[PDB]
From a paper:
FimH is an adhesin positioned on the fimbrial tip which binds to mannosylated proteins on the urinary tract epithelium via its lectin domain (FimHLD). FimH is composed of two domains, an N-terminal lectin binding domain (FimHLD) responsible for binding to the terminal mannose moiety on epithelial glycoproteins, and a C-terminal pilin domain (FimHPD). FimHLD transitions between two endpoint conformations: a ‘closed’ conformation with a high affinity for mannosylated proteins, and an ‘open’ conformation with a relatively compressed structure, a wide mannose binding pocket, that binds to mannosylated proteins with low affinity. Conformation and ligand-binding properties of FimHLD are under the allosteric control of FimHPD, which itself exhibits only minor structural changes upon ligand binding.
Among all conformationally stabilized FimH-DSG mutants, FimH-DSG TM was of most interest as it harbors the two Glycine loop mutations G15A and G16A designed to conformationally lock the mannose binding site in the ‘open’ state. To verify the conformation of FimH-DSG TM, the crystal structure of a FimH-DSG TM protein containing three glycosylation site mutations (N7S, N70S, and N228Q) was solved by X-ray crystallography at 1.9 Å resolution. There are four molecules of FimH-DSG TM in one asymmetric unit which share high similarity, therefore, structural analysis was done with protomer A. Introduction of the glycosylation site mutations did not appear to alter either the local or global conformations of the FimHLD and FimHPD. A15 projects towards the inside region of the clamp loop, providing rigidity, which causes the loop to widen at the end by ~1.2 Å (I13 Cα-S17 Cα) compared to the WT residue (G15), thus stabilizing the low affinity state. Additional rigidity is introduced by the G16A substitution, as it projects towards the bulk solvent. In comparison to previously published structures, the donor strand complemented FimHPD did not exhibit any conformational changes. Analysis by mass spectrometry confirmed that FimH-DSG retained a single glycosylation site at N235 in the exploratory antigen initially characterized in this study.
Author numbering: 1 to 300
The structure:
């Protein structure tokens, strides 16, 4: 049983522990989300098929590591789906040829939110998989571990929906003026989706985000979000209707809005969160998207 990664790196044969660096492409799917499809990342063969037939199983206790360790999901192992972390034995994968074959494994996460995400940095541990190798001629076995590490920066979705970006920055024209906010959402299947804004507001109406610019800021002005002129206050669910596989724009626009007194020259900045919720669902977790709105009041 000899394996290698898609990037050509050999996995130490017969080692009790190995660190395997792999690329992940997480995605929302119906009922569960893909974290990493290892069948496109790990390829294995038998160097001596005439003298031995290799059998490899995934063992109980295989689980996500690091920032994913509190999430439950499933593992698809050679066509069969199991709870992950693993509590059951898996069928054997037979290696009876010198021709490379993908290691038929994909790791999934059970959706818990509407459009939440978990950032995975490159070089971080994503899973600790326990393998057991046997053969067809004697009772010798070998139990070893593959520590799966991320090659790339990725965001693993934790809900039924995903966004065009997790962080969006827009620049308003000089006061007064408006700018569209490019931000869309889609769901693996049709969801009655909504969202709400969060941040710090300056007004009684809870609809003008405070200017938090630290250097030479303006006074008397904040940032207000609109949807075709309609004003969106903070902490107020806005329905998007039914959102399916085709991306739906939130239709948001940033504007300046007065907070009292003269609007004076300087920088304007507001950091606004966007959190998605299903119709009649709880407002769990933090912001799904962070919008940074920059602006400037210029003295005449
Ligand atoms: C948002 O609204 C909900 C419902 O009234 C309330 O429980 C929560 O405290 C509000 N949060 C803020 C920051 O106003």
């Amino acid at each position: 049983f000899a394996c290698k990664t898609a990037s050509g790196t050999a996995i130490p044969i017969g080692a009790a522990s190995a660190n395997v660096y792999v690329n992940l492409a997480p995605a929302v799917n119906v009922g569960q989300n893909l974290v990493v499809d290892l069948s496109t990342q790990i390829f294995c063969h038998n160097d001596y098929p005439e003298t031995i037939t290799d059998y490899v199983t995934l063992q109980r206790g295989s689980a996500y590591g690091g920032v994913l360790s509190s999430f439950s999901g499933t593992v698809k192992y050679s066509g069969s789906s199991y709870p992950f972390p693993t509590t059951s034995e898996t069928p054997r994968v037979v290696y009876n040829s010198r021709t490379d074959k993908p290691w038929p494994v994909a790791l999934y996460l059970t959706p818990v939110s509407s459009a939440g995400g978990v950032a995975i940095k490159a070089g971080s541990l994503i899973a600790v998989l326990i393998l057991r190798q046997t053969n067809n001629y004697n009772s010798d076995d070998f139990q070893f571990v593959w520590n799966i590490y991320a090659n790339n920066d990725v965001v693993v979705p934790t809900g039924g929906c995903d966004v065009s970006a997790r962080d969006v920055t827009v620049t308003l024209p000089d006061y007064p003026g408006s700018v569209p906010i490019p931000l869309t959402v889609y769901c693996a299947k049709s969801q009655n989706l909504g969202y709400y804004l969060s941040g710090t507001t300056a007004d009684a109406g809870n609809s003008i985000f405070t200017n938090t610019a630290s250097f030479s800021p303006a006074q008397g002005v904040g940032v207000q979000l609109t949807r075709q002129g309609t004003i969106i206050p903070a902490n107020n669910t806005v329905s998007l209707g039914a959102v399916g596989t085709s991306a739906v724009s939130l239709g948001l626009t940033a504007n300046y809005a007065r907070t009292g007194g003269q609007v004076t020259a300087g920088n304007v900045q507001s950091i606004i969160g966007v959190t998605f919720v299903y119709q009649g669902g709880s407002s769990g977790g933090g912001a799904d998207v962070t919008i940074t709105v920059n602006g400037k009041v210029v003295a005449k």
